[PDB]
Amino acid sequence: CDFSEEQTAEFKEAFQLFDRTGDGKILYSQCGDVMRALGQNPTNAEVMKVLGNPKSDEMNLKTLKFEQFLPMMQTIAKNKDQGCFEDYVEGLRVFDKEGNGTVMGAEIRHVLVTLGEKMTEEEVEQLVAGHEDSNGCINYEELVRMVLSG
Amino acid sequence: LDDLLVDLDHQRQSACNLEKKQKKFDQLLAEEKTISAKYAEERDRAEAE
Amino acid sequence: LDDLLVDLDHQRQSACNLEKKQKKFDQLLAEEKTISAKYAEERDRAEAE
Amino acid sequence: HNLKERYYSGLIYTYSGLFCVVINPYKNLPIYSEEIVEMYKGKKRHEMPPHIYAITDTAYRSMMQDREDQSILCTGESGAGKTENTKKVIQYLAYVAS
Amino acid sequence: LVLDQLRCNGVLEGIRICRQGFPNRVVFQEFRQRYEILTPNSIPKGFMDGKQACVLMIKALELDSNLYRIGQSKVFFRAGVLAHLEEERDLKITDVII
Numbered sequence: 001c002d003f004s005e006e007q008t009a010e011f012k013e014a015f016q017l018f019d020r021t022g023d024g025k026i027l028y029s030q031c032g033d034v035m036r037a038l039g040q041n042p043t044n045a046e047v048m049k050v051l052g053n054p055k056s057d058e059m060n061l062k063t064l065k066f067e068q069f070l071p072m073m074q075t076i077a078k079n080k081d082q083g084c085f086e087d088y089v090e091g092l093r094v095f096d097k098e099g100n101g102t103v104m105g106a107e108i109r110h111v112l113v114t115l116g117e118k119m120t121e122e123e124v125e126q127l128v129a130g131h132e133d134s135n136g137c138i139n140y141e142e143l144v145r146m147v148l149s150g
Numbered sequence: 151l152d153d154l155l156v157d158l159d160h161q162r163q164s165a166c167n168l169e170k171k172q173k174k175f176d177q178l179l180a181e182e183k184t185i186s187a188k189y190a191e192e193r194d195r196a197e198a199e
Numbered sequence: 200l201d202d203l204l205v206d207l208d209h210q211r212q213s214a215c216n217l218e219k220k221q222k223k224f225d226q227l228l229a230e231e232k233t234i235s236a237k238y239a240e241e242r243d244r245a246e247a248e
Numbered sequence: 249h250n251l252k253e254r255y256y257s258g259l260i261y262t263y264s265g266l267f268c269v270v271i272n273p274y275k276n277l278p279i280y281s282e283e284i285v286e287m288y289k290g291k292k293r294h295e296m297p298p299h300i301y302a303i304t305d306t307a308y309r310s311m312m313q314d315r316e317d318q319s320i321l322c323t324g325e326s327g328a329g330k331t332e333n334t335k336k337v338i339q340y341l342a343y344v345a346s
Numbered sequence: 347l348v349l350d351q352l353r354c355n356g357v358l359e360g361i362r363i364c365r366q367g368f369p370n371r372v373v374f375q376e377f378r379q380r381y382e383i384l385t386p387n388s389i390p391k392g393f394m395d396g397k398q399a400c401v402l403m404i405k406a407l408e409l410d411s412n413l414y415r416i417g418q419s420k421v422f423f424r425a426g427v428l429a430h431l432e433e434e435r436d437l438k439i440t441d442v443i444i
């Protein structure tokens with residue numbers, strides 16, 4: 001495998017933190033959580049593709065191991081379709097009306113819930129939380145800068 | 151009103167006739183996508199191997 | 200008469216989709232060849248890998 | 249004819265440019281539930297069939313975007329369904345704008 | 347009874363104004379930021395008049411002359427034009443939101 005052992009040890013240590021799985025295994029639905037916590041930013045489509053296009057019911061009746069999870073993360077790191085933050089900060093400007101580097105939080109919540117891969121109301125609230133202001137607007141630039149540092 | 155109806159008849163017939171031949175073009179693009187999809191399936195299974 | 204205009208507008212508006220479809224045949228079909236060729240090379244590279 | 253076909257088929261709501269039309273069904277229809285309210289959550293007017301929930305969502309989105317107030321007015325003769333329409337609008341607003 | 351209500355309620359007259367008229371209308375400045383992603387390479391990268399700027403966007407979108415009316419402060423649109431631009435706008439940024 002084209003992956004050093006130094007970071008592999010830390011990856012194994014992080015994967016062993018779940019525990020709640022019977023033993024050294026991992027569920028299909030919980031695979032994305034461990035894949036996104038270690039690093040990278042895979043999408044739902046990418047997760048379903050690397051997982052071999054699992055069935056709807058297969059996401060809760062089977063479990064994988066680490067020998068199969070390592071190549072998944074390897075491919076996600078090597079092969080990816082993400083992009084830098086320069087394109088993200090410029091994409092959110094489409095919703096800016098006045099053009100003063102601010103956008104309404106409700107519009108961002110709606111765009112995140114409907115447009116794209118859709119997100120639950122529990123996640124969008126935590127995402128937009130903290131950036132509350134008097135005018136109810138959230139600077140997309142600061143939002144992207146904070147999300148990139150996460 | 152009669153001129154618009156007569157003019158719309160040629161547009162409807164032309165649009166329908168043009169759309170008929172355009173279906174083959176759209177099908178050709180879909181056929182190329184389906185043919186290219188075979189490579190994706192081979193590449194997807196290849197990555198799994 | 201306005202009803203024919205609405206129908207004519209919808210019929211005339213369809214020309215934009217048909218006109219754009221004509222340019223798409225030289226762009227969508229042309230771009231599809233590159234995507235199909237890229238998939239053929241990706242599957243070959245994936246199989247080789 | 250369109251109104252009759254929509255009423256006899258189980259469709260009391262019908263759009264009309266910028267204002268929706270409603271017909272009193274005189275019977276509790278199954279077009280009112282939490283699942284339907286969640287389905288209409290964040291959906292354009294031309295994305296779901298005619299329904300008071302769609303008009304309420306459109307008005308809410310317009311108010312949140314243009315920052316301008318709204319008014320869900322209901323006009324009709326005595327016994328047309330204005331009270332039920334207002335009830336459903338308030339329910340949708342309380343379930344969505346919470 | 348339904349015919350007598352549709353006459354006084356103005357349902358028929360309320361629909362013709364939306365079809366023959368222009369129920370849609372956006373300000374010059376509001377129409378730019380809300381639809382510039384559709385035709386980015388159309389307006390010169392710099393300062394430009396708000397009224398003349400919208401003319402270049404409409405010309406690049408290949409919109410029929412009978413589907414908009416340029417005024418002194420807003421850009422009118424027929425019933426159903428903004429609905430198509432909204433779907434095309436979201437489809438363009440779909441790759442960015444995902």
Ligand SMILES: Nc1ncnc2c1ncn2[C@@H]1O[C@H](COP(=O)(O)OP(=O)(O)O)[C@@H](O)[C@H]1O
Nearest residue numbers: 272273274275276277326327328329330331332
């Ligand atoms: N949309 C509807 N669906 C089901 N029943 C309705 C609807 N609208 C009205 N009704 C029925 O009609 C009856 C009388 O309604 P009413 O309160 O007179 O309406 P309004 O206040 O608009 O005149 C109610 O008992 C109600 O069950």
